[PDB]
């Protein structure tokens, strides 16, 4: 069987960055030439692997993470970076072995009045560990008085919505990002090239 990269890259709607989706890739044959031979990607950066040699390699574990972020935050999807996305939404490891793929989605994820369905975690007390997902909706305590589910001063909802409109600049325009994680261990392979 062919690996289900179409169901990840060509999904009608992507997940929010705070609740980034992970699709496990196993027991299939992956033709990565469908990705690196395309001109529809604005970002295609592979760490520890060469994009042209992917079809000549076998992997024990492969994961595909997908989410939507702003154009100015694609840089944060990289090892050693800092920011709202890297610290509180999606953290890449320092020893990352994989590829980060992004493409502009203004014609799909931006609405005339503003698409407010895509969310990012704004308030958090600690930085995320690598490959960690936090989907909590608990009210964030900015002071010393507990919130107890009531929003107000020093008591804020942790998730804020992106304002995606077609008039937004490239930095504020939505970008769909797919992160591929490759694990090469001393174990039988599960994903191989044709």
């Amino acid at each position, epitope marked *: 069987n062919l690996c289900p990269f179409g169901e990840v890259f060509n999904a009608t709607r992507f997940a929010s960055v705070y609740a980034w989706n992970r699709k496990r890739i196993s027991n299939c044959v992956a033709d990565y030439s469908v990705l*690196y*031979n395309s001109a529809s990607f604005s970002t*295609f*950066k*592979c*760490y520890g*692997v*060469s*994009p*042209t040699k992917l079809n000549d390699l076998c992997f024990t574990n492969v994961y595909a993470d997908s989410f939507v972020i702003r154009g100015d935050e694609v840089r944060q999807i*990289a*090892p*050693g*970076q*800092t920011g709202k996305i890297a610290d509180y939404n999606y953290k890449l490891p*320092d*020893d*990352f072995t994989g590829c980060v793929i992004a493409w502009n989605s203004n014609n799909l994820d931006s609405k005339v009045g503003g698409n407010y369905n895509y969310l990012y975690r704004l308030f958090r007390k600690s930085n995320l560990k690598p490959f960690e997902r936090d989907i909590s909706t608990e009210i964030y305590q900015a002071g010393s008085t507990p919130c107890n589910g009531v929003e107000g001063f020093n008591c804020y909802f942790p998730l804020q919505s992106y304002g995606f409109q077609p008039t937004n600049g490239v930095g504020y325009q939505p970008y769909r990002v797919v992160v591929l994680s490759f694990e090469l261990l001393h174990a039988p392979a599960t994903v191989c090239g044709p």
Partner: nanobody, 126 residues
């Protein structure tokens, strides 16, 4: 956890030479590529040299190629920058940082600096 400390800077004359050193700790030194960066007053931080974890591959900016030598000792945890034939345009605060090398579907080694910085060392050419 990562700690980077630069040393070796000072006042130097054009045509002179200075050796900079960067002591590193808090991570596996040989598993990460390292690079030297500099920021002059009024201008953005600029990349100078890039060296792999093993030290077998080194890359330099055009402004310093043929003048600056980037090296590392993995037995110790020190990164070195040998600057020769210095010019007044080289006056800046020099920083060392971890970096991740990425490849594109049609390109080669490109460098991204980790956003962790030490104090740096001052080099003044005059």
């Amino acid at each position: 956890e990562v700690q980077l400390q630069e040393s070796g800077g000072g006042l130097v004359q054009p045509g002179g030479s200075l050796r900079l050193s960067c002591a590193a700790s808090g991570f596996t030194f040989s598993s990460y590529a390292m690079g030297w960066y500099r920021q002059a007053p009024g201008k953005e931080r600029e990349w100078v040299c890039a060296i792999s974890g093993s030290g077998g591959s080194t890359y330099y900016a055009d402004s310093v190629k043929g003048r600056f030598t980037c090296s590392r000792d993995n037995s110790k945890n020190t990164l070195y920058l040998q600057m020769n034939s210095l010019k007044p345009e080289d006056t800046a605060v020099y920083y060392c940082a971890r970096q991740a090398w990425y490849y594109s579907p049609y390109g080669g080694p490109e460098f991204e600096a980790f956003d962790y910085w030490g104090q740096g060392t001052q080099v003044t050419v005059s």
